[PDB]
Short mmCIF file of C-alpha atoms in Angstrom, two decimals:
data_model
loop_
_atom_site.label_atom_id
_atom_site.label_comp_id
_atom_site.label_asym_id
_atom_site.label_seq_id
_atom_site.Cartn_x
_atom_site.Cartn_y
_atom_site.Cartn_z
CA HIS A 20 3.65 -1.69 -20.38
CA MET A 21 0.87 -0.56 -17.74
CA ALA A 22 0.94 -3.30 -16.45
CA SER A 23 4.43 -2.70 -15.30
CA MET A 24 4.07 0.38 -13.63
CA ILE A 25 1.14 -0.26 -12.11
CA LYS A 26 2.75 -3.19 -9.97
CA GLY A 27 0.91 -3.87 -6.77
CA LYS A 28 -1.23 -0.54 -6.46
CA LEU A 29 -4.88 -1.41 -6.91
CA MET A 30 -7.99 -1.33 -4.24
CA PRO A 31 -10.48 -2.83 -5.90
CA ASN A 32 -12.62 -0.59 -6.65
CA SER A 33 -16.01 -1.26 -4.72
CA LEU A 34 -14.41 0.41 -1.60
CA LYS A 35 -14.08 3.42 -3.21
CA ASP A 36 -16.90 5.02 -1.29
CA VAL A 37 -16.12 3.19 2.16
CA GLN A 38 -12.81 4.50 1.84
CA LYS A 39 -15.09 7.62 1.41
CA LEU A 40 -17.15 6.85 3.77
CA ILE A 41 -14.00 6.34 5.59
CA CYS A 42 -12.17 9.20 5.42
CA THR A 47 -17.89 6.36 12.25
CA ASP A 48 -20.92 3.95 13.20
CA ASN A 49 -22.30 3.67 9.28
CA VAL A 50 -19.40 1.81 8.22
CA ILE A 51 -18.87 -0.80 11.36
CA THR A 52 -22.12 -2.13 9.54
CA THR A 53 -20.64 -0.66 5.68
CA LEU A 54 -17.16 -3.01 6.25
CA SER A 55 -19.07 -5.08 8.65
CA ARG A 56 -20.41 -7.04 5.04
CA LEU A 57 -17.70 -6.88 2.89
CA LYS A 58 -16.62 -10.49 2.27
CA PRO A 59 -13.14 -10.79 3.58
CA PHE A 60 -10.99 -10.75 0.77
CA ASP A 61 -12.13 -7.02 0.02
CA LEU A 62 -11.95 -6.16 3.84
CA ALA A 63 -8.36 -7.37 3.35
CA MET A 64 -7.90 -5.29 0.67
CA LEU A 65 -9.18 -2.15 2.21
CA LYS A 66 -7.11 -2.01 4.87
CA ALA A 67 -4.14 -3.88 3.25
CA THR A 68 -4.34 -1.94 -0.47
CA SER A 69 -5.65 2.74 1.45
CA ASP A 70 -4.48 5.94 1.65
CA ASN A 71 -2.56 5.59 4.79
CA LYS A 72 -4.76 7.82 7.01
CA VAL A 73 -7.68 5.64 6.91
CA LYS A 74 -4.65 2.53 7.33
CA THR A 75 -5.29 3.73 10.89
CA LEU A 76 -8.54 2.02 11.56
CA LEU A 77 -6.71 0.32 13.82
CA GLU A 81 -12.11 2.06 18.56
CA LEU A 82 -13.34 -0.51 16.37
CA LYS A 83 -11.24 -2.53 18.14
CA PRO A 84 -14.38 -4.87 18.91
CA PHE A 85 -14.78 -4.48 15.05
CA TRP A 86 -11.74 -6.72 14.69
CA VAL A 87 -11.51 -9.01 17.41
CA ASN A 88 -15.27 -10.91 16.50
CA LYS A 89 -13.78 -11.06 12.85
CA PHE A 90 -11.00 -12.90 14.55
CA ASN A 91 -12.09 -15.06 16.30
CA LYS A 92 -14.03 -16.59 13.94
CA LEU A 93 -10.92 -17.52 11.62
CA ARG A 94 -11.78 -21.37 11.28
CA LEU A 95 -9.10 -23.91 9.78
CA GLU A 96 -11.56 -25.86 7.24
CA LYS A 97 -8.81 -28.35 8.11
CA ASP A 98 -9.50 -29.26 12.65
CA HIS A 99 -12.70 -27.78 13.29
CA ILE A 100 -11.37 -28.35 16.94
CA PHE A 101 -8.92 -24.87 16.29
CA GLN A 102 -8.97 -21.50 17.16
CA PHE A 103 -6.60 -18.59 16.50
CA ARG A 104 -4.63 -17.65 20.19
CA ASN A 105 -3.97 -13.74 20.72
CA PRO A 106 -1.32 -12.85 17.85
CA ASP A 107 1.30 -11.10 20.41
CA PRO A 108 2.35 -7.85 18.88
CA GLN A 109 0.31 -8.10 16.28
CA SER A 110 -3.36 -6.70 16.30
CA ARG A 111 -6.31 -8.67 15.65
CA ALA A 112 -6.69 -6.75 12.78
CA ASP A 113 -3.09 -7.35 10.60
CA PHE A 114 -2.93 -11.46 11.11
CA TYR A 115 -7.32 -11.67 10.12
CA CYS A 116 -6.37 -9.56 6.77
CA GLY A 117 -2.87 -11.78 5.98
CA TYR A 118 -4.25 -15.08 6.94
CA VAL A 119 -7.23 -13.62 4.71
CA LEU A 120 -5.25 -12.62 1.87
CA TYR A 121 -2.81 -16.50 1.87
CA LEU A 122 -5.51 -18.14 2.17
CA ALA A 123 -6.58 -16.14 -1.60
CA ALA A 124 -3.06 -16.56 -3.13
CA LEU A 125 -4.00 -20.51 -2.49
CA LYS A 126 -6.81 -19.94 -3.96
CA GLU A 127 -4.80 -18.79 -6.60
CA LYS A 128 -2.16 -20.41 -7.03
CA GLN A 129 -3.17 -22.45 -9.90
CA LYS A 130 -5.30 -20.76 -12.10
CA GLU A 131 -3.41 -16.98 -12.01
CA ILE A 132 0.08 -17.32 -10.58
CA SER A 133 0.12 -12.84 -10.59
CA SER A 134 -2.51 -13.17 -8.15
CA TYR A 135 -0.75 -15.50 -6.31
CA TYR A 136 2.77 -13.35 -6.31
CA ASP A 137 0.94 -9.59 -5.39
CA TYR A 138 -1.77 -11.62 -2.79
CA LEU A 139 1.11 -13.91 -1.33
CA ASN A 140 3.32 -10.51 -1.21
CA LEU A 141 0.81 -8.14 0.55
CA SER A 142 0.20 -11.15 3.03
CA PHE A 143 3.83 -11.14 3.83
CA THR A 144 4.64 -7.30 3.25
CA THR A 145 1.43 -5.50 4.31
CA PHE A 146 1.01 -7.77 7.52
CA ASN A 147 3.94 -9.65 8.10
CA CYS A 148 1.70 -12.57 8.08
CA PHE A 149 3.89 -15.53 8.93
CA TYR A 150 2.05 -18.20 6.42
CA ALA A 151 2.70 -16.07 3.02
CA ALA A 152 6.49 -15.97 5.07
CA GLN A 153 7.10 -19.67 5.19
CA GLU A 154 4.78 -20.29 1.80
CA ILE A 155 7.51 -17.75 0.05
CA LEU A 156 10.21 -19.15 1.39
CA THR A 157 9.05 -23.18 -0.20
CA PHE A 158 8.67 -20.93 -3.53
CA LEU A 159 11.22 -20.10 -3.45
CA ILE A 160 13.62 -23.37 -2.85
CA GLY A 161 11.20 -25.55 -4.95
CA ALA A 162 12.83 -22.59 -7.40
CA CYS A 163 15.82 -23.00 -6.25
CA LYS A 164 15.52 -26.87 -6.23
CA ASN A 165 14.99 -26.57 -10.15
CA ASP A 166 16.64 -24.07 -11.43
CA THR A 167 20.49 -24.80 -9.07
CA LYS A 168 22.66 -21.89 -10.09
CA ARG A 169 24.57 -19.71 -8.33
CA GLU A 170 22.93 -16.83 -8.60
CA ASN A 171 19.36 -18.14 -7.77
CA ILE A 172 21.21 -18.97 -4.45
CA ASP A 173 22.18 -15.75 -4.06
CA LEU A 174 18.49 -14.34 -4.88
CA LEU A 175 17.26 -16.84 -1.61
CA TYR A 176 20.45 -16.22 -0.12
CA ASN A 177 19.51 -12.18 -0.04
CA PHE A 178 15.77 -12.42 0.17
CA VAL A 179 16.54 -14.76 3.08
CA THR A 180 19.10 -11.90 4.97
CA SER A 181 16.56 -9.27 3.87
CA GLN A 182 13.74 -10.05 5.75
CA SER A 183 15.12 -12.19 8.65
CA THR A 184 14.44 -9.62 10.80
CA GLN A 185 10.96 -9.05 10.17
CA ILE A 186 10.27 -13.12 9.98
CA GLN A 187 12.24 -12.80 13.47
CA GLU A 188 8.79 -10.80 14.88
CA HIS A 189 7.32 -14.14 14.96
CA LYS A 190 9.96 -15.36 17.32
CA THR A 191 10.72 -19.46 17.48
CA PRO A 192 7.90 -20.10 14.62
CA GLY A 193 10.08 -17.59 12.50
CA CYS A 194 13.21 -18.26 13.96
CA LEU A 195 12.70 -21.93 12.55
CA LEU A 196 11.31 -20.91 9.25
CA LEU A 197 14.63 -18.56 8.82
CA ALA A 198 16.99 -22.11 10.10
CA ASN A 199 14.95 -23.79 7.36
CA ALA A 200 15.73 -21.87 4.32
CA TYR A 201 19.55 -21.71 5.54
CA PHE A 202 19.59 -25.09 5.91
CA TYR A 203 18.08 -25.72 2.32
CA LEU A 204 20.88 -22.67 1.04
CA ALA A 205 24.00 -24.61 2.52
CA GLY A 206 22.83 -27.93 0.57
CA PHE A 207 22.57 -26.29 -2.61
CA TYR A 208 25.67 -24.00 -2.25
CA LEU A 209 26.87 -27.70 -0.77
CA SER A 210 26.29 -29.35 -4.32
CA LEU A 211 27.33 -27.23 -6.17
CA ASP A 212 30.86 -26.86 -4.73
CA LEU A 213 30.52 -23.39 -2.86
CA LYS A 214 31.90 -24.95 -0.19
CA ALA A 215 32.33 -21.46 2.49
CA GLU A 216 28.64 -20.65 1.08
CA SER A 217 28.05 -24.17 2.40
CA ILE A 218 28.96 -23.56 5.58
CA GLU A 219 28.28 -19.75 6.53
CA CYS A 220 24.52 -20.66 6.18
CA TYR A 221 24.82 -24.17 8.03
CA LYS A 222 26.96 -21.78 11.51
CA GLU A 223 23.79 -19.71 9.92
CA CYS A 224 21.17 -22.21 10.64
CA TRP A 225 22.45 -23.29 14.13
CA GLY A 226 22.18 -19.46 14.62
CA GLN A 227 18.84 -19.88 13.53
CA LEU A 228 17.82 -23.13 16.12
CA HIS A 229 19.96 -21.44 19.29
CA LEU A 230 17.32 -18.19 18.60
CA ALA A 231 13.82 -20.21 18.27
CA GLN A 232 15.31 -21.48 20.93
CA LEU A 233 15.76 -18.80 24.10
CA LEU A 234 12.58 -18.06 22.42
CA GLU A 235 10.19 -20.79 22.76
CA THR A 236 9.20 -20.46 26.22
CA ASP A 237 8.36 -16.68 25.78
CA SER A 238 5.56 -17.98 21.96
CA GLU A 239 3.47 -20.64 23.09
CA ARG A 240 0.88 -18.52 21.76
CA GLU A 241 3.28 -17.73 18.33
CA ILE A 242 4.08 -21.13 18.16
CA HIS A 243 0.05 -22.12 18.60
CA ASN A 244 -0.43 -20.15 15.73
CA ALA A 245 2.34 -20.84 13.71
CA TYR A 246 1.46 -24.75 13.69
CA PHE A 247 -2.29 -24.54 14.01
CA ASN A 248 -1.67 -26.42 17.56
CA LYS A 249 0.05 -29.32 15.96
CA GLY A 250 3.49 -28.88 17.89
CA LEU A 251 6.45 -28.14 16.18
CA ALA A 252 6.57 -31.69 13.22
CA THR A 253 6.30 -29.79 10.24
CA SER A 254 8.48 -27.02 11.37
CA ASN A 255 11.41 -29.11 10.05
CA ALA A 256 12.27 -31.43 7.19
CA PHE A 257 13.11 -33.79 9.44
CA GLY A 258 9.56 -34.31 11.30
CA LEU A 259 10.83 -33.70 15.30
CA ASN A 260 8.85 -32.30 18.04
CA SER A 261 11.25 -30.07 20.35
CA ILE A 262 14.73 -28.40 18.66
CA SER A 263 17.11 -30.77 20.32
CA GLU A 264 15.88 -32.92 18.40
CA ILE A 265 16.12 -30.48 15.31
CA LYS A 266 19.94 -29.11 16.84
CA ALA A 267 21.01 -33.31 16.97
CA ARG A 268 20.14 -34.51 13.31
CA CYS A 269 21.41 -31.53 11.69
CA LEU A 270 24.07 -31.41 13.43
CA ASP A 271 24.39 -35.02 12.88
CA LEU A 272 24.22 -34.05 9.10
CA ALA A 273 26.72 -31.00 8.77
CA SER A 274 29.14 -31.96 11.69
CA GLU A 275 32.23 -30.37 9.70
CA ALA A 276 30.35 -27.75 9.29
CA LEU A 277 29.63 -26.80 13.02
CA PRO A 278 32.49 -26.71 14.83
CA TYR A 279 32.87 -26.49 18.46
CA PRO A 280 33.87 -22.55 18.38
CA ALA A 281 31.09 -22.54 15.51
CA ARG A 282 28.73 -23.20 17.24
CA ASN A 283 29.82 -21.00 19.56
CA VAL A 284 29.89 -18.11 17.68
CA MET A 285 26.67 -18.66 16.49
CA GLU A 286 24.85 -19.51 19.86
CA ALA A 287 26.04 -16.11 21.17
CA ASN A 288 25.63 -14.16 18.34
CA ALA A 289 21.58 -15.60 19.05
CA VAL A 290 21.23 -14.84 22.65
CA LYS A 291 22.42 -11.34 21.82
CA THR A 292 19.56 -10.45 19.70
CA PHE A 293 17.25 -12.68 22.51
CA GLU A 294 19.60 -10.15 25.14
CA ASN A 295 18.10 -6.59 23.82
CA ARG A 296 15.82 -6.56 21.06
CA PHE A 297 13.25 -9.77 23.15
CA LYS A 298 11.83 -8.79 26.34
CA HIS B 20 9.55 -16.55 -11.63
CA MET B 21 12.06 -16.34 -8.16
CA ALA B 22 12.18 -12.54 -9.32
CA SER B 23 8.39 -12.17 -10.19
CA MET B 24 7.83 -13.19 -7.06
CA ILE B 25 10.00 -10.78 -5.35
CA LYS B 26 8.73 -8.43 -6.49
CA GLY B 27 9.49 -4.64 -5.08
CA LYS B 28 13.77 -4.13 -4.50
CA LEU B 29 16.07 -6.14 -1.84
CA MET B 30 18.33 -4.33 0.38
CA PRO B 31 20.85 -4.00 -1.21
CA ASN B 32 24.54 -5.31 0.37
CA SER B 33 26.55 -2.40 0.25
CA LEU B 34 23.94 -1.30 2.49
CA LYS B 35 24.50 -4.27 5.33
CA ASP B 36 26.67 -3.17 6.94
CA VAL B 37 26.59 0.36 7.40
CA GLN B 38 23.13 -1.91 8.87
CA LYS B 39 24.83 -3.39 12.11
CA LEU B 40 26.59 0.27 12.86
CA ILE B 41 23.21 1.60 13.23
CA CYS B 42 21.54 -0.64 15.14
CA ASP B 43 24.66 -1.11 17.28
CA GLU B 44 25.22 2.48 18.32
CA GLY B 45 22.26 4.69 18.32
CA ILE B 46 22.92 8.09 16.79
CA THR B 47 26.29 8.40 16.90
CA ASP B 48 27.80 11.25 15.82
CA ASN B 49 29.48 8.13 14.12
CA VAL B 50 26.33 6.62 12.26
CA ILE B 51 25.97 10.51 11.28
CA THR B 52 29.35 11.12 9.27
CA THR B 53 29.00 7.27 7.79
CA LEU B 54 25.44 8.41 6.52
CA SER B 55 26.71 11.56 5.19
CA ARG B 56 29.24 9.60 3.47
CA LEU B 57 26.78 7.62 1.82
CA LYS B 58 25.75 7.79 -1.58
CA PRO B 59 22.50 10.01 -2.04
CA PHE B 60 21.10 6.91 -3.50
CA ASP B 61 22.22 4.38 -0.99
CA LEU B 62 21.25 6.84 2.19
CA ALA B 63 17.47 6.92 0.19
CA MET B 64 17.27 3.05 -0.30
CA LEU B 65 19.39 2.10 2.71
CA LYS B 66 15.09 4.43 4.86
CA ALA B 67 13.66 2.59 2.05
CA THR B 68 14.84 -0.45 2.46
CA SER B 69 16.08 -1.12 6.29
CA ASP B 70 13.90 -3.12 9.26
CA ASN B 71 11.92 -1.48 11.61
CA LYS B 72 14.77 -0.56 14.26
CA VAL B 73 16.63 1.58 11.34
CA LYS B 74 13.73 2.88 10.08
CA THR B 75 12.48 3.93 13.41
CA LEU B 76 16.39 4.70 13.95
CA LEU B 77 16.88 6.79 11.31
CA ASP B 78 12.77 8.82 11.67
CA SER B 79 14.45 9.36 15.11
CA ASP B 80 15.44 12.91 16.54
CA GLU B 81 18.79 12.63 16.96
CA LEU B 82 19.21 12.12 12.90
CA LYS B 83 16.23 14.80 12.19
CA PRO B 84 18.83 17.67 11.68
CA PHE B 85 20.53 15.12 9.77
CA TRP B 86 17.57 14.89 6.88
CA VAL B 87 17.07 19.14 7.30
CA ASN B 88 20.43 19.86 6.84
CA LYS B 89 20.50 16.95 3.38
CA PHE B 90 17.92 19.47 2.51
CA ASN B 91 19.09 22.05 2.03
CA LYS B 92 21.76 20.98 -0.13
CA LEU B 93 19.15 19.63 -2.30
CA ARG B 94 19.64 21.63 -5.65
CA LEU B 95 17.17 22.14 -9.32
CA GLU B 96 20.53 21.18 -11.60
CA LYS B 97 18.72 24.42 -14.19
CA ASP B 98 17.44 26.53 -11.27
CA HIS B 99 20.75 27.90 -9.25
CA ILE B 100 18.78 30.12 -6.73
CA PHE B 101 15.65 27.44 -6.21
CA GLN B 102 15.02 26.46 -2.01
CA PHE B 103 13.02 23.87 -1.50
CA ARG B 104 10.55 24.55 1.58
CA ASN B 105 9.69 22.91 4.14
CA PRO B 106 7.09 19.92 2.90
CA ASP B 107 5.19 19.87 6.80
CA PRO B 108 3.28 17.32 7.07
CA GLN B 109 5.83 15.25 6.04
CA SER B 110 8.87 14.86 7.39
CA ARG B 111 12.68 16.21 5.31
CA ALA B 112 14.07 12.81 5.09
CA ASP B 113 10.84 11.71 3.74
CA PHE B 114 10.83 14.35 1.01
CA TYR B 115 15.42 13.56 0.51
CA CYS B 116 14.76 10.20 -0.59
CA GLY B 117 11.66 9.59 -2.33
CA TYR B 118 12.59 13.33 -4.88
CA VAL B 119 16.38 11.38 -5.02
CA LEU B 120 14.53 8.10 -5.60
CA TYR B 121 13.00 9.68 -8.20
CA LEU B 122 15.79 11.47 -9.59
CA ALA B 123 17.41 8.29 -9.92
CA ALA B 124 14.18 6.83 -11.93
CA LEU B 125 15.08 9.33 -15.04
CA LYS B 126 18.43 8.24 -14.87
CA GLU B 127 17.24 4.38 -15.27
CA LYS B 128 14.48 5.97 -17.47
CA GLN B 129 16.31 4.52 -20.86
CA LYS B 130 19.33 3.66 -20.36
CA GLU B 131 17.40 0.97 -18.03
CA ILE B 132 13.42 0.13 -18.12
CA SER B 133 11.35 -2.37 -15.01
CA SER B 134 14.38 0.40 -12.74
CA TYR B 135 11.96 3.18 -13.91
CA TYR B 136 9.49 0.58 -12.88
CA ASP B 137 10.99 0.04 -9.29
CA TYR B 138 12.25 3.43 -8.04
CA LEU B 139 9.50 5.72 -9.05
CA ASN B 140 7.35 2.90 -7.69
CA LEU B 141 9.38 3.52 -4.65
CA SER B 142 9.64 7.42 -4.65
CA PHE B 143 5.63 7.14 -4.88
CA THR B 144 4.56 4.32 -2.77
CA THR B 145 7.25 4.37 -0.18
CA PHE B 146 7.27 7.68 0.45
CA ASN B 147 4.08 9.45 -1.43
CA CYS B 148 6.24 12.03 -2.90
CA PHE B 149 4.64 13.95 -6.06
CA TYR B 150 7.15 13.88 -8.62
CA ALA B 151 7.41 9.81 -8.55
CA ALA B 152 3.14 10.38 -8.91
CA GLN B 153 3.65 13.62 -12.22
CA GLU B 154 6.10 10.75 -13.84
CA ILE B 155 3.79 7.98 -13.46
CA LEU B 156 0.24 9.01 -14.27
CA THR B 157 2.75 10.89 -17.56
CA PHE B 158 3.94 7.66 -18.08
CA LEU B 159 -0.15 6.09 -18.19
CA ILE B 160 -1.66 8.71 -20.15
CA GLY B 161 1.09 7.70 -23.27
CA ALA B 162 0.77 5.12 -23.43
CA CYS B 163 -3.24 5.62 -23.82
CA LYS B 164 -2.05 8.14 -25.73
CA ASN B 165 -0.22 5.86 -27.62
CA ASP B 166 -2.66 2.43 -27.25
CA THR B 167 -6.31 3.92 -26.92
CA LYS B 168 -8.46 0.80 -25.75
CA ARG B 169 -10.99 0.74 -23.16
CA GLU B 170 -8.73 -1.55 -21.11
CA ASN B 171 -6.05 0.38 -20.49
CA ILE B 172 -8.37 3.65 -20.11
CA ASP B 173 -9.23 1.10 -17.71
CA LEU B 174 -6.15 0.66 -16.24
CA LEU B 175 -5.73 4.77 -15.58
CA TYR B 176 -9.29 5.45 -14.66
CA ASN B 177 -8.58 3.03 -11.76
CA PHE B 178 -5.65 3.98 -10.57
CA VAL B 179 -6.12 7.61 -10.46
CA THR B 180 -9.05 6.46 -8.19
CA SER B 181 -7.43 4.07 -6.21
CA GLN B 182 -4.09 5.78 -5.45
CA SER B 183 -6.53 9.67 -5.66
CA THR B 184 -7.46 10.20 -1.77
CA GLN B 185 -2.67 9.64 -0.86
CA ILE B 186 -2.77 11.95 -3.61
CA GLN B 187 -4.50 14.56 -2.66
CA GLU B 188 -2.51 14.70 0.90
CA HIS B 189 -0.46 17.04 -2.17
CA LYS B 190 -2.93 19.05 -1.20
CA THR B 191 -3.56 21.39 -3.44
CA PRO B 192 -1.16 20.64 -7.14
CA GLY B 193 -2.16 16.26 -5.78
CA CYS B 194 -5.89 17.94 -7.24
CA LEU B 195 -4.98 19.67 -9.54
CA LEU B 196 -2.31 16.55 -10.95
CA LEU B 197 -5.73 14.45 -10.48
CA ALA B 198 -7.76 17.28 -12.22
CA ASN B 199 -5.02 16.69 -14.98
CA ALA B 200 -5.54 12.92 -15.64
CA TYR B 201 -9.41 12.79 -15.43
CA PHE B 202 -9.94 15.23 -18.27
CA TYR B 203 -7.21 12.71 -20.26
CA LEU B 204 -9.64 10.50 -19.57
CA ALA B 205 -12.72 12.25 -20.07
CA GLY B 206 -10.85 12.88 -23.30
CA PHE B 207 -10.07 8.60 -24.61
CA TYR B 208 -14.29 7.79 -22.96
CA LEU B 209 -14.78 9.60 -26.14
CA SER B 210 -13.26 9.60 -28.50
CA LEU B 211 -13.99 5.68 -28.19
CA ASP B 212 -18.25 6.00 -27.31
CA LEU B 213 -18.29 5.95 -23.69
CA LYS B 214 -20.12 9.46 -22.59
CA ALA B 215 -21.05 8.04 -19.69
CA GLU B 216 -17.50 7.20 -18.14
CA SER B 217 -17.04 10.55 -20.91
CA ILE B 218 -19.47 12.39 -18.70
CA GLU B 219 -18.07 10.99 -15.55
CA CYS B 220 -14.69 11.91 -15.70
CA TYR B 221 -15.42 15.42 -15.86
CA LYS B 222 -17.40 15.55 -13.24
CA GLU B 223 -14.60 13.91 -11.26
CA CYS B 224 -12.75 16.70 -13.27
CA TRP B 225 -14.47 19.62 -11.81
CA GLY B 226 -14.58 17.88 -7.80
CA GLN B 227 -10.22 18.35 -8.15
CA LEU B 228 -10.54 21.58 -9.35
CA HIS B 229 -12.60 23.10 -6.91
CA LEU B 230 -11.03 21.02 -4.95
CA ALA B 231 -8.52 22.51 -5.42
CA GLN B 232 -9.36 26.33 -4.95
CA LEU B 233 -10.25 25.99 -1.71
CA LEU B 234 -6.85 24.05 -0.60
CA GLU B 235 -4.97 26.63 -2.53
CA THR B 236 -4.72 29.89 -0.17
CA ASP B 237 -3.54 27.03 2.12
CA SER B 238 -0.66 24.83 0.26
CA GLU B 239 1.82 27.69 -0.39
CA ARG B 240 4.56 26.28 0.06
CA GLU B 241 3.29 22.24 -2.01
CA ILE B 242 2.85 24.26 -4.66
CA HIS B 243 6.51 25.97 -4.11
CA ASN B 244 8.07 22.13 -4.84
CA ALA B 245 5.32 20.52 -6.63
CA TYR B 246 6.00 23.21 -9.07
CA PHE B 247 9.80 24.64 -8.25
CA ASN B 248 8.18 28.38 -7.81
CA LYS B 249 7.62 28.37 -11.37
CA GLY B 250 3.87 28.77 -10.57
CA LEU B 251 0.68 26.51 -11.84
CA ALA B 252 1.21 27.11 -16.22
CA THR B 253 2.86 23.34 -15.50
CA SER B 254 -0.57 21.38 -13.65
CA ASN B 255 -2.37 21.75 -16.26
CA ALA B 256 -2.59 20.88 -20.49
CA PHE B 257 -3.95 25.37 -21.23
CA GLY B 258 -0.68 26.01 -19.09
CA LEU B 259 -2.36 28.45 -17.38
CA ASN B 260 -1.34 30.91 -14.46
CA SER B 261 -4.69 29.99 -12.09
CA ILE B 262 -7.65 28.16 -11.25
CA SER B 263 -9.98 30.59 -12.60
CA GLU B 264 -8.66 30.05 -15.83
CA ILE B 265 -8.17 26.80 -15.25
CA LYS B 266 -11.94 25.96 -14.42
CA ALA B 267 -12.98 28.25 -17.16
CA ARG B 268 -11.16 26.72 -20.02
CA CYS B 269 -11.88 23.06 -19.23
CA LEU B 270 -15.99 24.67 -18.75
CA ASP B 271 -15.70 25.59 -21.70
CA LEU B 272 -14.12 22.61 -23.47
CA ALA B 273 -16.42 19.90 -21.33
CA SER B 274 -20.00 22.19 -21.96
CA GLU B 275 -22.01 19.31 -22.07
CA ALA B 276 -20.71 17.63 -20.17
CA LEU B 277 -20.87 20.52 -17.57
CA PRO B 278 -24.03 21.49 -17.39
CA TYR B 279 -24.56 23.74 -13.96
CA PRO B 280 -26.45 21.31 -11.85
CA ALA B 281 -23.19 18.63 -12.33
CA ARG B 282 -20.44 21.34 -11.44
CA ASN B 283 -23.32 21.73 -8.94
CA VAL B 284 -22.74 18.37 -6.92
CA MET B 285 -19.49 17.79 -7.99
CA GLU B 286 -18.08 21.38 -6.71
CA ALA B 287 -20.94 20.63 -2.90
CA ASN B 288 -18.63 17.39 -2.96
CA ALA B 289 -15.36 18.91 -2.86
CA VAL B 290 -16.36 21.43 -0.12
CA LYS B 291 -17.58 18.09 2.34
CA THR B 292 -14.61 16.44 1.51
CA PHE B 293 -12.38 20.71 1.83
CA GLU B 294 -14.28 20.85 5.24
CA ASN B 295 -14.56 16.80 6.39
CA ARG B 296 -10.08 16.53 5.84
CA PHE B 297 -8.45 19.43 4.88
CA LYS B 298 -9.83 22.39 7.81
#
């Protein structure tokens, strides 16, 4: 039973001393040779008074700039906007670790992905979570499987729109698949509400594109938008055009206008 | 599958409406009166499961007379005269919602588990509610009384160690809570002949007891709230009323593990932790 009470509440005990040592200048050298997983778990799994290791900023700038993509030695991450380099570093490290446990231990795939997403709002943890949930709903197409993915999508929208354009394209992604899920299950009123819902994310990403050059650079590893959407298209206008083209009956002119108005409303107030 | 991917709870749908009303109109005599009419559970999960613009409205200044009025209403069912005291350094709101979710956890304790876990965990992790910590530790300790395996004991040990510093935010009661767990850890290892681990938790238990002494005179409000103004007797397995009695009894029981030099090292470490982090 103990496993069910303790879910995500265990700091590797190799970090007890560093958390004690922290809660200076010798820390800077203690912190500097934990392996990247342990550093990310220290910031992810500490009292909230130690989590304010947000003075140590040159430490994170050096670690952030050593972040590479194994698949492209040319690529280098750009300033992660509003989020700290510490949080982009630690979220991305935990994301990679989750993929490494992907097929050897699933209970760490969940836990690390959850830490990556919930603690540091890492975009890749969001994209990985959504892809797995969509996969779960591809196989088991029941209405309370779709409703669960739907309910997760709506609860995490606002936090996922902190990545602007990629977040909104990610969110438009989930709504499009939700819409196709409800349709096949003959729940056409809800199929419509997610097609309109997907149009609104597409338009808000559209409004935010010019302010998310760095977000798009990091989100797609400087490869553009092709992998942000199931159509492999390179521009949002191609995404909308193909999308309306598939869902014309669910996206009437006024329907597209309500969502576009609401999308402008969030850009109006919540952004800049 | 999905339930394991979406580990903790999600925002309840009754609150998506109140979430809009708050995201448009700031703290309004309108908002303040919708919130006052929400159920205590729904208010607490609203503060626990909202985005950052509702969590910084709820935390705003203008809703603070709201939370103070709600906090003075908090009452003990079986005690008709207990007043909670200011949980400072903590918010009145966070003490309210963490305590509300804790009570919500107990009402689910025997009707549906895993609502016991989720609410208990939210209470502890999101609001660092002392009572959720005590319930969790009591359950983990209970799990090892029934299942005295080295792998359960290590699980309890590693949890106690990972949550040590957060629990000490409760100052004197928090340290007594940890001293209890370390004491039970010490006896579990001893029964299994893991005498190096038994000695190591007796020393940890002495250090928590001594830090409790240093923080006691500074923890009048925490002690008031932690034990519902009934004193320290329920903070320790002996039902004793003072930390000095607790230390004396503990030293009697763990003599061979708490010789003079060992106790002196642990007390020294406690003095450093008190001086650096507390006074």
